[PDB]
Structures are given as structure tokens and as C-alpha cells.
Design a protein around this ligand. Structure first.
Ligand SMILES: [Cl-]
Length: 71
């Protein structure tokens, strides 16, 4: 599954994940890519706040979906 994550400057991160990856797993991938600590990351998809212990499939996140890092 390929997804995009936009940082707070609009920089695009491209990630490879599985549909049942947790948001915690995605946060670790963003940390590796950009150095942003997971506890400072807050992710939104289609206006929905994503929780660390839930999965991408729980939120209907699909191929080429874009997630946003927010304050
Ligand atoms: Cl896992």
C-alpha cells in the first residue's frame, strides 16, 4: 500500500505500508524519514484524527491516500 504524508511545511513523505499497519507503525516510518518524534506527530486523514493504536484500514485509508501532520 503506498500512502503520502504531508509535513507541516507541505513536504511530501512517501511511505510503503500494509492495510492493517497501526498509526504507531506509520509514526515510526515518519520518524525514520524525517526525524520527527512520534510523540510530537498528530495525523489527520480526510478530517479524521488518527489514533496510534488503530490501523489504516480502520480509517478507510487506501492506495495514494494523503495523511497530514498537524499541530
Ligand atoms: Cl505490525
Amino acid at each position: 500500500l503506498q500512502i503520502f504524508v504531508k509535513t507541516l511545511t507541505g513536504k511530501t513523505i512517501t511511505l510503503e505500508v500494509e492495510p492493517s499497519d497501526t498509526i504507531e507503525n506509520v509514526k515510526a516510518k515518519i520518524q525514520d524519514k524525517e526525524g520527527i518524534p512520534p510523540d510530537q506527530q498528530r495525523l489527520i486523514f480526510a478530517g479524521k484524527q488518527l489514533e496510534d493504536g488503530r490501523t489504516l484500514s480502520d480509517y478507510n485509508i487506501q492506495k495514494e491516500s494523503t495523511l497530514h501532520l498537524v499541530l
